[PDB]
Structure 1
Amino acid sequence: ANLKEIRAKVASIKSTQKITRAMQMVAASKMRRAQERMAQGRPYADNMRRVIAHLVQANPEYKHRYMVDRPVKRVGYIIVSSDRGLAGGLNINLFKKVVQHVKAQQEQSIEVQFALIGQKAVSFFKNYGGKVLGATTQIGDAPS
């Protein structure tokens, strides 16, 4: 029954098995890289929080529009996603969460607007409809 075909198929599967092991090897290293890159952004935010807090507490005359809670009529979402698949159920779970949150906001009779980052989110919420305000694609690993 053409056993050489089955032998070739087994060889090809065993080759792809080697192919994926190396991709795992690389993904671990980039996870380490991004993990240590997350740390370098901390001092800037810390210093800015300190300065803003001191400035706002020392001069309590006025309240800025970003620090006061006004009644809600419309909300907004900034959705970040990946550019290519083959990464678990990351995007699917994130989109399920945001869809459930939007449905919960719908009963409050407040509509939503979006701003999408990453190709997967762009496609998903272009098919979903909604009120898009902007789109961005090809962010990369170390965005500027």
Structure 2
Amino acid sequence: ANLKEIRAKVASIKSTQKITRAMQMVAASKMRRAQERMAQGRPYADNMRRVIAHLVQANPEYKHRYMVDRPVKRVGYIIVSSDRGLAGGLNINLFKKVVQHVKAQQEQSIEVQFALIGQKAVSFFKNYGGKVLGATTQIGDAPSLEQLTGSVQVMLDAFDKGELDRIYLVSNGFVNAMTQKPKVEQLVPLAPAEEGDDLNRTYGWDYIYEPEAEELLNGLLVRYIESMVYQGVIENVACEQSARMVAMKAATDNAGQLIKDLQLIYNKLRQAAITQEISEIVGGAAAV
């Protein structure tokens, strides 16, 4: 209730509001950078999907196992989340959706395994428990694919033995600068759609490959999977910045409201103190 306490509080809140506004501007600037990077490999994955469409077009008799579903079992969830806090509810919303969908398989009792990329993800998965076969941290704003090749490589190596059934990828979708959605998808099986390009006007002669097209797609397929997971993780990274701007702007507004209320209380206390001092002085001067 001391006047100096209120003064210190208002000064501290002013400084904090200024630095939070500066951080909001910083986050706004960082927002676009990743948007641009996405637009860079977006054609890549787009032309890559055009490639994979050509890849599936090849070896018409041969069939790869990636296009079938074994008895649904051994579900594997890959989680990408922030390494730092203050991302709004994005982390908690994604994790809540993760655990709720985990009940799904848990409902028909499908064994659940998970891999993580985020630091908050590793903290949450350690607090919950279980055993994690792949954990990474400190990936970076623009991580090289090698930084993440190990997790997907070991996961695919594990699936190559047939132990796993399929991997259920998790990440966030950035709709606009103010709207994100925690999204869960499936990646291991692939089905072409609207890829009729080069099909209505395909060359009459058969595309004969000097290299063996029997295995040429294999590396491209693994190339396809690493490209898509890199695109997903970079999209999540870009979306992560989009939450911080609104978080800090809301924090600044709340700080403004609080400082207004504190100013009201401060004025009331100051007037009361002045009145009390004047009354005491007059009363004492009457005594003498």
TM-score scaled by length of structure 1: 0.90
Q: Secondary structure at the match of 1:115?
A: strand
Identity of aligned residues (%): 100
* Partner residue, 1:104: 104
Runs of 4+ with deviation above 6 angstroms: none
Deviations 1:98-139 (A, max 9, x none): 100000111212111111101000010111123411100011
Q: Secondary structure at the match of 1:77?
A: strand
Q: 1:78, 1:116 within 8 Å by CA — same for their partners in 2?
A: yes
User: Residues of 2 paired with 1:70 and 1:63: CA distance?
Assistant: 15
Deviations 1:67-116 (A, max 9, x none): 22222121101100101101101110000001000001112121111111
CA RMSD of aligned residues (A): 1.4
**Structure with bigger gyration radius:** 2
50-59 vs 84-93, greater mean Cα deviation: 50-59
Give the structure, 1 or 2, with the largest relative contact order (CA under 8 Å, sep 6 or more): 2
* Partner residue, 1:29: 29
Q: Secondary structure at the match of 1:114?
A: strand
Gaps of 5+ in 2: 142-288
Q: Secondary structure at the match of 1:54?
A: helix
Gaps of 5+ in 1: none
47-56 vs 88-97, greater mean Cα deviation: 47-56
Q: 1:74, 1:112 within 8 Å by CA — same for their partners in 2?
A: yes
Deviations 1:9-41 (A, max 9, x none): 211111111111101000111111111111111
User: Residues of 2 paired with 1:40 and 1:117: CA distance?
Assistant: 23
Q: 1:114, 1:130 within 8 Å by CA — same for their partners in 2?
A: no
Q: 1:112, 1:130 within 8 Å by CA — same for their partners in 2?
A: no
For residue 63 of structure 1, report the CA deviation from its aligned partner: 1.8
Q: Secondary structure at the match of 2:138?
A: coil
User: Residues of 1 paired with 2:128 and 2:74: CA distance?
Assistant: 18
* Partner residue, 1:85: 85
114-123 vs 2-11, greater mean Cα deviation: 2-11
Change (3 A) 1:55 1:87: closer
77-86 vs 105-114, greater mean Cα deviation: 105-114
53-62 vs 82-91, greater mean Cα deviation: 53-62
Flag the structure with higher helix content. 2
User: Residues of 1 paired with 2:8 and 2:73: CA distance?
Assistant: 63
Q: 1:81, 1:91 within 8 Å by CA — same for their partners in 2?
A: yes
For residue 5 of structure 1, report the CA deviation from its aligned partner: 2.9
User: Residues of 2 paired with 1:60 and 1:119: CA distance?
Assistant: 44
Correspondences of 1:1-144 after superposition (within 5 Å): 2-141=2-141
User: Residues of 2 paired with 1:38 and 1:110: CA distance?
Assistant: 35
Q: Secondary structure at the match of 2:79?
A: strand
TM-score scaled by length of structure 2: 0.47
